[PDB]
Structures are given as C-alpha cells and as structure tokens.
Amino acid sequence: MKTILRFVAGYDIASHKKKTGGYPWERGKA
C-alpha cells in the first residue's frame, strides 16, 4: 500500500457521505 492515498482519498469522502457498514475491527487496525 504505497499509493493507497488515491484509494483512501475516495473512501474518506464516501464513508463520510454515506457512512455505513464498518466493523469495530475492520477499521484499519483501529
């Protein structure tokens, strides 16, 4: 995960817009 910045970038917005489906352990090592 070197250029994941492009992947997480969209997730940071999509997760903030929709906000749903997110396990307590499946949150990027907390």
What descriptive keywords fit this protein?
mainly alpha
Count of distinct strands? 0
Q: Number of helix segments?
A: 1
Q: Categorize the overall geometry.
A: flat
Q: Which structural class should the secondary elements be placed in?
A: mainly alpha
Helix content: 40-55%
**What Rg is obtained from the alpha carbons, in whole angstroms?**
10 Å
Q: How are helices and strands ordered from N to C?
A: H
| Most strands sheet | none
Strand content: under 5%
N- to C-terminal distance: 17 Å
Keywords: Plasmid
Protein name: LsbB
What would a concise description of this structure say?
The chain has 30 residues and is mainly alpha-helical. It has one helix spanning 5-17.
Architecture overview:
- It comes from Lactococcus lactis subsp. lactis (Streptococcus lactis).
- This is LsbB.
- Keywords: Plasmid.
- It is a single chain.
- The protein is mostly helical and 30 residues long.
- It has one helix and no strands.
- The chain is flat, with a radius of gyration of 10 Å.
List the helices and strands and how they pair.
Blueprint: H1 5-17
